[PDB]
Amino acid sequence: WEIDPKDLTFLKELGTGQFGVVKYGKWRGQYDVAIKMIKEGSMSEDEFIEEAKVMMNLSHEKLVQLYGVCTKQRPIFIITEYMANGCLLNYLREMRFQTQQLLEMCKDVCEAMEYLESKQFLHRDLAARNCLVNDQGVVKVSDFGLSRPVRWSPPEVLMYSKFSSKSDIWAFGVLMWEIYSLGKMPYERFTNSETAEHIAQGLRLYRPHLASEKVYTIMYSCWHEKADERPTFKILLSNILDVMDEE
Amino acid sequence: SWEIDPKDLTFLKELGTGQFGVVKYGKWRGQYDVAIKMIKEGSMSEDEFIEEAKVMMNLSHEKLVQLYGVCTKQRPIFIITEYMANGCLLNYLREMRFQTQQLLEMCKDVCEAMEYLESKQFLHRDLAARNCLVNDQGVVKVSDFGLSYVLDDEYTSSVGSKFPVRWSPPEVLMYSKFSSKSDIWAFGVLMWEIYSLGKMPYERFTNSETAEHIAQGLRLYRPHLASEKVYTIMYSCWHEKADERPTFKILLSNILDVMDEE
Ligand SMILES: [Cl-]
Ligand SMILES: [Cl-]
Numbered sequence: 001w002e003i004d005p006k007d008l009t010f011l012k013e014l015g016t017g018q019f020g021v022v023k024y025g026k027w028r029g030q031y032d033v034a035i036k037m038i039k040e041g042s043m044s045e046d047e048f049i050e051e052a053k054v055m056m057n058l059s060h061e062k063l064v065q066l067y068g069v070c071t072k073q074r075p076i077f078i079i080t081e082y083m084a085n086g087c088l089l090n091y092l093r094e095m096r097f098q099t100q101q102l103l104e105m106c107k108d109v110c111e112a113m114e115y116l117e118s119k120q121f122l123h124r125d126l127a128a129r130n131c132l133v134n135d136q137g138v139v140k141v142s143d144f145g146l147s148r149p150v151r152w153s154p155p156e157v158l159m160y161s162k163f164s165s166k167s168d169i170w171a172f173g174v175l176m177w178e179i180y181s182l183g184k185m186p187y188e189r190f191t192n193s194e195t196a197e198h199i200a201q202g203l204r205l206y207r208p209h210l211a212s213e214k215v216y217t218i219m220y221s222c223w224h225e226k227a228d229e230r231p232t233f234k235i236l237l238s239n240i241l242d243v244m245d246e247e
Numbered sequence: 248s249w250e251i252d253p254k255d256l257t258f259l260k261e262l263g264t265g266q267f268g269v270v271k272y273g274k275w276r277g278q279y280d281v282a283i284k285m286i287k288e289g290s291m292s293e294d295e296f297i298e299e300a301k302v303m304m305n306l307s308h309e310k311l312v313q314l315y316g317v318c319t320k321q322r323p324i325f326i327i328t329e330y331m332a333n334g335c336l337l338n339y340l341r342e343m344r345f346q347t348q349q350l351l352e353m354c355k356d357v358c359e360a361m362e363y364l365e366s367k368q369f370l371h372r373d374l375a376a377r378n379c380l381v382n383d384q385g386v387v388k389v390s391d392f393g394l395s396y397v398l399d400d401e402y403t404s405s406v407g408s409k410f411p412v413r414w415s416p417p418e419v420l421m422y423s424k425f426s427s428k429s430d431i432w433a434f435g436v437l438m439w440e441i442y443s444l445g446k447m448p449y450e451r452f453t454n455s456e457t458a459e460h461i462a463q464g465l466r467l468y469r470p471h472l473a474s475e476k477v478y479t480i481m482y483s484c485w486h487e488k489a490d491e492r493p494t495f496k497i498l499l500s501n502i503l504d505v506m507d508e509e
Contacts, residue, residue: 005266013261013269018253019283019325021261021269035267040377041413041447041454042403051404074341074447077267078402089288093322124405129288146402151289185322191292 001049001056003027003068003079008035016086017094024082027067032082037075038146045071052078055145058119062112064132064142078146083132091133092183099210100247101137105179107240108139113172114233116144117165124163126171127152128178150195151186156227158196166227172236173222180208180215214243249300251275251316251327256283264334265342269400272330275315280330285398288323296324296396303393306369310360312380312390326394333381340376340445347472348509349385353441355502356387361434362495364392365427372425374433375414376440412454413447418489420458428489434498435484442470442477461485476505 008025016022023035038048052069059065065081085091088105109131116123123130123144130143154170156162174186186205187195195203204223207216218239224230231239256273264270271283286296296319303314313329333339336353357379364371371378371392378391391397403409416432418424436448448467449457466485469478480501486492493501 011263011267013263015259015261015271018321019259019271019285021271023263023267023269037267037401039401039403039409042409043407044453047404047407145405147405148399148402183322185289188289192289 001053001068002072003070005070005073005077008033008079017090020086020090022082022086025079027079031067032084033067033079034082036078036080036146038078040075045076048076051145054121058116058121058144060112060115062108062138062140063115063144064140066146080142081140083140083142084135085133085137087129088131088133088139089128089178089183092128092179097182099212100244102179102210103215103240103244103247105139106176107237107244109141109172109175110233110237110240112141113168114237116141117168117233120165121145122163122165123168123171125149125152126168126175128175128183131175150192150199153199154223154227155200155225158199162227164227165232166230169222169230169233169236172233173219174205176215176219176222177205177208177211180211180219182210184208212243212247214246218243249297249304249316250320251318253318253321253325256281256327259283265338268334268338270330270334273327275327279315280332281315281327282330284326284328284394286324286326286394287396287398290396293319299393300326302369306364306367306392308360308363310356310386310388311363311392312388314394323398326397328390329388331380331388331390332383333385335377336379336381336387337376337440337445339381340441345444347474348506350441350472351477351502351506353387354438355499355506357389357434357437358495358499358502360389361430362499364389365430365495368427369393370425370427371430371433373411373414374430374437375411376437376445379437408454410454413449413457416485416489417458417461417487420461424489426489427494428492431484431492431495431498434495435481436467438473438477438481438484439467439470442473442481444470444472446470474505476508480505 007028010026012024014022014024025033027033055066067079070077131139132142152171152174154167157167221231255276258274260272262270262272273281275281300317315327317326379387380390414433414436416429419429483493
């Protein structure tokens with residue numbers, strides 16, 4: 001779990017998107033990593049390590065892997081799976097896409113979230129800005145456990161701060177909409193405060209142009225007023241794979 | 248005047264700052280070194296953003312990191328700011344070497360900036376060494392005021408908090424009462440950061456234990472590099488009662504006096 005920073009080589013400052021930057025390195029001369037800093041005094045060294053251990057046991061191909069941590073200097077740093085094509089949101093906006101590729105992106109994320117659901121691990125901030133794309137165009141979920149969102153939040157979260165797997169389900173629906181809208185911001189004609197109000201009164205996202213009726217049904221199933229009547233990530237993955245068979 | 252065309256940006260580079268930090272550098276109109284920072288998307292209206300950017304651009308002082316402009320015509324919004332070669336003050340304190348006269352000079356720089364902000368009734372709200380930058384001449388300037396809604400690549404527990412408890416006075420922790428006097432408190436802690444050469448305040452306390460400690464009347468210890476007079480100044484910032492804390496004008500007077508007494 002602990003990392004010696006002398007096992008890091010080929011340290012670089014890379015560009016991502018137009019103005020973004022990433023600290024790149026090689027870990028043990030095999031793994032491409034991004035190096036991220038932990039905010040000082042934001043948690044105990046105890047709390048940090050236990051959370052890092054939970055996160056490192058979360059192993060799935062469509063989760064951005066945490067390879068380890070370094071706590072022997074200030075600030076603490078983490079090293080994560082390097083993702084060449086960067087943020088999914090930026091990726092949606094730049095490029096090109098066939099509708100099959102969009103549904104593939106939804107499947108990738110749904111697999112990741114199915115896994116997290118199976119581990120009873122809540123993401124709490126699922127969104128396109130929190131997904132990354134590798135060189136092969138595979139989408140992976142990131143910014144879980146350690147993180148840096150009204151428009152991604154269900155009523156029960158906005159009103160009562162009730163987080164559950166079903167609040168992640170809701171966010172996933174909004175992420176599907178982000179993907180199929182090619183990276184539009186949800187509820188873009190509303191402010192954060194207006195969004196919270198209107199959502200409580202039953203506002204929902206429109207069907208994106210590129211989404212079929214079946215695709216819309218799936219993302220819309222995520223936005224049921226009652227949390228318990230929203231599907232699971234397993235069900236969603238089934239629904240997505242069925243639509244792939246048909247489309 | 249406030250709006251920027253990104254085609255006026257040249258010599259775009261990705262620079263290192265500290266061990267693992269990164270900065271997006273550019274030239275604006277071939278006569279300004281700038282850092283390019285992105286704004287967190289949908290954190291405010293385009294109305295709210297622009298009015299705040301205008302307030303910030305009218306804040307002109309040599310020891311404030313200048314905001315040169317904004318670009319709102321693409322997603323995300325970005326801002327361009329005065330480039331500061333020697334980077335974050337906290338990292339700067341930890342690397343280097345320092346004479347005690349240089350440490351007090353750093354405090355003066357910041358106090359000048361804060362005196363100016365106080366004169367404009369503009370609250371910083373998050374004054375700390377991590378929010379000060381150092382230029383090529385070794386001059387310290389205050390940054391991350393107004394727009395702190397900048398995209399940050401620093402991580403925390405999604406259960407934990409990112410609120411700066413260790414820089415906050417009782418009335419902020421208890422009642423969220425921000426004033427110039429809560430900035431005064433933070434300035435005291437920044438002085439301690441400077442004179443401790445970049446230690447974290449209350450290192451062996453949690454945020455909750457820190458709040459308890461202050462409530463008992465206890466304060467950050469005198470760093471060995473601080474004189475009695477220097478400690479008196481930073482300590483004056485931590486009065487339990489906000490109204491009995493000094494102003495930035497008073498602090499600047501106190502600092503300049505101590506400089507005279509070489
Ligand atoms: Cl590479
Ligand atoms: Cl659309």
